[PDB]
Amino acid sequence: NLMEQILSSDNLNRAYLQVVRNKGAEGVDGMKYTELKEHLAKNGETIKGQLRTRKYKPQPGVPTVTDRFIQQAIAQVLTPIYEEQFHDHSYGFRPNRCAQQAILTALNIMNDGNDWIVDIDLEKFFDTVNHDKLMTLIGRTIKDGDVISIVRKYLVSGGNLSPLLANIMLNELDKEMEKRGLNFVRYADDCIIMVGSEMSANRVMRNISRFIEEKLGLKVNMTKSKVDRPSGLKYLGFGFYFDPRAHQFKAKPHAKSVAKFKKRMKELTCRSWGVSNSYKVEKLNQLIRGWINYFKIGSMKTLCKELDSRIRYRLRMCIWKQWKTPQNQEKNLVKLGIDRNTARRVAYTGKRIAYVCNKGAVNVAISNKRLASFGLISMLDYYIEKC
RNA sequence: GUUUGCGCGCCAUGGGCGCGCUCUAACGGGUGUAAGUCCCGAACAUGCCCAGGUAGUGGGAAAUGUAUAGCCGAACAGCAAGGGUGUCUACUGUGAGGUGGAAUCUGAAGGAAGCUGUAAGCGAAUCUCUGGUCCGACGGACAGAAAUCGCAUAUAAGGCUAGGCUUCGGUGAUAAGCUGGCAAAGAACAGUGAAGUCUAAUAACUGAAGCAGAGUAAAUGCGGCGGAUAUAUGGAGAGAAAGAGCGUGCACCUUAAGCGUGGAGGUCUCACAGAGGUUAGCCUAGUAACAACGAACUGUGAGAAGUCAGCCGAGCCCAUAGUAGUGAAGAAGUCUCUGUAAUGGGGAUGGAGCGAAGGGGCGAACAAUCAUAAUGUCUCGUAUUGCAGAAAUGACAACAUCUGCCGUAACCAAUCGGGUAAAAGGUGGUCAAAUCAAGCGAGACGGAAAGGAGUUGAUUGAACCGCCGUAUACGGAACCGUACGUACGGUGGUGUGAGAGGUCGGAAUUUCUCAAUUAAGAGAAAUUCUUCCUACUCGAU
Ligand SMILES: [Mg+2]
Ligand SMILES: [Mg+2]
Ligand SMILES: [Mg+2]
Ligand SMILES: [Mg+2]
Ligand SMILES: [Mg+2]
Ligand SMILES: [Mg+2]
Ligand SMILES: [Mg+2]
Ligand SMILES: [Mg+2]
Ligand SMILES: [Mg+2]
Ligand SMILES: [Mg+2]
Ligand SMILES: [Mg+2]
Ligand SMILES: [Mg+2]
Ligand SMILES: [Mg+2]
Ligand SMILES: [N+]
């Protein structure tokens, strides 16, 4: 009787609105989402009748758009009550639960202080999930067989049902962990399992690997699942370092994240690019606001300030490259506020001279007040304003 | 749309080939028939070293200058004919315009074959060895192409820039080159420096190799192989060898800003003749051109400024023009040798031709895009088959599970020797199934319709980045350039920059009309896009 809760007008138009805010790729059908609106406006009774009578035949590298609308409706009807069923320490794919408070909870329980962290990974998770056991757990939760029927025929056949199915299969494991009394966090697929003793770390490793391999039907790789120290194993782009005050085990962005940050930065502000530097300033601003809104809790202030110095040196180097003509280089430099002959010698020197750019009168030619007049915000200020 | 950039002609102050004299190693001597060629000698000044934080004397090792006849002139200065101004001004014309000046800018990398004077540099047949460099196209180095070989090469080789760290911390001089954190190349300065050769002398006083990174790219790097090498490339050895200036000759050969001349096509001005409307009187423009508003259009005649940028483009068309030119020192054409990738070059006949400039058109071709007898399957039966739920009873109290301990160590933290399934230990019986069983299915079996594995039309190809070869020049030998330097022949890449004016064409949309003024339908003025045009204004080469 729950497909009779599915096929209700507010649920359908909310699912439709969510799919058109997704703006997903069309793919094999190649069918555009406003025409998805038109096609559902002409096929609503047909699709709803097929849902009632279970003769729907959905078909997939990119899913079909009407199938995406059906996914969104199924997820919208299935997340409530399940959220009460799901473990409260599982922070994936729900409203009001993200990875940042997952790392915050992890910080709380390493303030409790479990030593060796078991990074449990499950390679090819959708391959290891059995359809029958997942449907069995769904049938144990919801008794009406029509939704079980459509989810089953869909599973034999981004996606908005894969979060719920992953959360179901992981949440049974989370309930078993709470049955053990063990402490652990997981976002979506990656599990950090926290234990204070290396012998107990290997014991919990063996227990969990055997429990995953037989009862759940899933498989855990022996590559990622090493019982290692927190400084050597990362969780969602975050590394953990030791505050040398004994009470905290503090967080930082893992160096691969900052490597990606630096790489995208340097590939965005190449001074051989032909685009105006206001556009590059705005793109830089987009990346920094996203990067703070993700990595707020983990500290890299001693690293991000060196990166700030790199930011302003790179901007001054880019502006010097974009001026590109020695005569107007001299003219713009003397407009900047330096004397004529120093501008002359610097302008004839201006070919190459990366060394004069990183330190010299070139670095004084564009300063912090001038780049604040340009309008780009610093990383440190976006820290001190952020909660 | 980047000062110049077109055709034809003349002229070397350019080069070559013959001739003539004369000069040549500081100054001097030898040597030998013969020295410009081979040998020998002095002084001063500089570099380098004795300073040992210094620096004036005082001395020494290589090297260099004074010091070949002579060359060539800096990214050096001064001059400078010319060229520009969208800057002022005097004159001249009815007018398009012309001319002369003041204020400047330029006077360049391709002919005032610009002038004068410098710094630095150079500076002698040929042979041999060697270092360095450059080249053997372009194309991230494929394809294509006449156009080396093998690897490597972008989340980035390899070259650099500044630090951390492992190990060692008097000999020099010379001097092509290499690098100074990257498009490429050059100058200057700085720091190093290959092959060798020469030298390894004298008494003092007042930092280099290797390992990991962090940076740093408009891409090449490394190793052969062939070749080139007069910025007279760095040197080493043979070599009684040739170099330099000046004059001069040729039926010798060339030059983009010099000199003379030629300008189509298209734009503008003016006076005549025909239309036009203004009220026999006026005007015939303004808008960059196109379109449009418009009376504002057209054949004449008189002029004026004026060209000249490969990009798909053979050839035909217009006009200067079959003219300027060129051609009897000898044209077109024919015949016979010959080269290249292609363009080309001789020779013999032959006895009059041959034959320009810029701008628009049309346009073949080339290129791109677009047109041109199984499986299988839907529907019932038929019993299996995939996972869950309490478990009479049977077997076993042995399996799941959370908690990191030993000592030793002067106090363990292998922080010292064990052990990571080290110990002490909590919690929960653990299961094979009599038994039955929602829901979703998934397969498997028959009966049930059939079916089965070359060519041409059209549209676009705006503009650019180059590269190679012969010829011809310059900055700066190579390299990098000078519009790809330019001409001709070869050859790959990128693909439609802004603003403004149009075309407001086509569609959506604001407003109207139509389909009944009803569709998310169609159309008309115009908003956006799109299509197309425009150097008109900017930007790019
Ligand atoms: Mg070449
Ligand atoms: Mg080359
Ligand atoms: Mg190349
Ligand atoms: Mg490397
Ligand atoms: Mg020499
Ligand atoms: Mg004239
Ligand atoms: Mg073209
Ligand atoms: Mg063309
Ligand atoms: Mg030169
Ligand atoms: Mg070259
Ligand atoms: Mg070149
Ligand atoms: Mg070039
Ligand atoms: Mg160019
Ligand atoms: N030009």
Side-chain angles (χ1 to χ4, degrees), chain A residues 198-259:
Chain A
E198 226 276 349
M199 179 264 324
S200 292
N202 264 347
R203 191 82 39 81
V204 158
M205 173 47 176
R206 290 195 301 284
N207 297 330
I208 280 172
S209 47
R210 165 183 22 127
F211 172 55
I212 285 278
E213 281 151 353
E214 289 150 332
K215 193 262 157 199
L216 283 93
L218 308 181
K219 184 76 217 74
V220 156
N221 47 356
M222 91 318 296
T223 80
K224 274 288 302 209
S225 86
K226 305 347 297 193
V227 277
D228 302 338
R229 287 313 303 250
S231 62
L233 273 187
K234 89 175 217 174
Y235 184 50
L236 304 181
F238 281 51
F240 259 36
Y241 73 77
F242 188 39
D243 172 32
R245 154 191 54 252
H247 184 223
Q248 273 52 36
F249 207 119
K250 276 277 168 155
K252 91 193 179 194
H254 180 296
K256 174 58 57 167
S257 272
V258 167

Side-chain angles (χ1 to χ4, degrees), chain A residues 129-142:
Chain A
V129 162
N130 220 30
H131 297 320
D132 184 330
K133 180 76 151 284
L134 169 57
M135 291 334 306
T136 315
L137 181 32
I138 287 153
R140 201 185 305 135
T141 56
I142 172 66

Side-chain angles (χ1 to χ4, degrees), chain A residues 97-145:
Chain A
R97 236 182 283 266
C98 313
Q100 276 137 20
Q101 51 282 52
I103 303 294
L104 200 165
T105 315
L107 204 144
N108 292 128
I109 319 147
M110 328 283 277
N111 286 336
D112 165 283
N114 266 331
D115 218 21
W116 297 80
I117 294 319
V118 187
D119 286 38
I120 282 286
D121 163 32
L122 312 78
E123 33 77 18
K124 301 304 290 318
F125 171 78
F126 204 50
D127 186 29
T128 46
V129 162
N130 220 30
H131 297 320
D132 184 330
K133 180 76 151 284
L134 169 57
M135 291 334 306
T136 315
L137 181 32
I138 287 153
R140 201 185 305 135
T141 56
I142 172 66
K143 304 97 185 160
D144 312 306

Side-chain angles (χ1 to χ4, degrees), chain A residues 47-59:
Chain A
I47 292 298
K48 287 183 34 213
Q50 286 144 30
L51 289 200
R52 293 183 251 271
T53 74
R54 291 167 305 192
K55 272 291 202 222
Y56 192 16
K57 203 81 56 195
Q59 193 288 338

